Design a binder for this molecule. Sequence first.
Ligand code: HEM
Ligand SMILES: [O-][O-]
Length: 295
Amino acid sequence: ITTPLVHVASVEKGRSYEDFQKVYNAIALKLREDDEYDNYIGYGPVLVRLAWHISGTWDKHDNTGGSYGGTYRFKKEFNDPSNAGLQNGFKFLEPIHKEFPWISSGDLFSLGGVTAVQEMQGPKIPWRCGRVDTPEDTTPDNGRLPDADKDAGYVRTFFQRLNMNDREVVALMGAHALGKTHLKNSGYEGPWGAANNVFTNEFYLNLLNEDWKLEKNDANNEQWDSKSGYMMLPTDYSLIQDPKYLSIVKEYANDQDKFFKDFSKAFEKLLENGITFPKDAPSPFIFKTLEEQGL
Ligand code: HEM
Ligand SMILES: [O-][O-]
């Protein structure tokens, strides 16, 4: 019988809020310093994509994958064609992991995404420690991450495996306001908007205000390009092709606060999928930004 395995969270021995706040600051200080990466966009978006890819492998049916084991450090998940380009985010976190060797890989990978969102004027995201590194045999096989060449029916059915409903799915997809698609990484080229390193509801505004047309890129893939220079993945554009997705898209495009709150809950839920938190485990941490600390 394949009963769901239980990944009990174990706080790192003798570590509290102040210990993980220093990790947040080490990540945040390096974000403002290494600001020339990828045409001065910064390492922000790739750290958000890292934390999502290390969590998106989760399977709710047998509790395999997820952010608990930090198995992205192993060669099988590291060389995922879906994870192309995430090596830049890993190398970004290597000097920080050497400075804080006590933190686990899963905790560092997920906290990197939380830090990037908050340091890019995004909402506060409650974060929790306790992820424990698991052996290499626990690394999930390739193919668990979604394809960008699909429609709304695929997006809804894929995220059901991550225990995510429609409103929660539209919220997480709003993180595509950050960064761009790299043709050498995924076969798509172009950013979604103008504010590449500022967390905003711009992803929804461009989906409704721009005149999109299906075009073919240099990688023979087809994507939706606008005359302003923005692009949308077929999975992105399906958020307005689906009527249920569309009403949530218009809701977020009209209310940035409603989008920030829904993303903060959905992103933490994504980073905590598959982890059993005991009763003696501490409450989620709300990390102060560098601006709130005067740093
Ligand atoms: C069906 C769901 C999704 C699909 C198919 C998808 C697909 C993609 C693809 C193909 C790229 C291009 C990466 C590159 O070429 O470098 C990308 C980038 C990105 N994705 Fe997604 N994604 C999905 C969901 C998400 C979620 C849930 C998040 C965050 C919570 C997210 C955040 C990002 C970010 C920040 C980037 C920018 C990466 C960079 O600038 O280096 N995406 N996505
Ligand atoms: O993001 O796949």
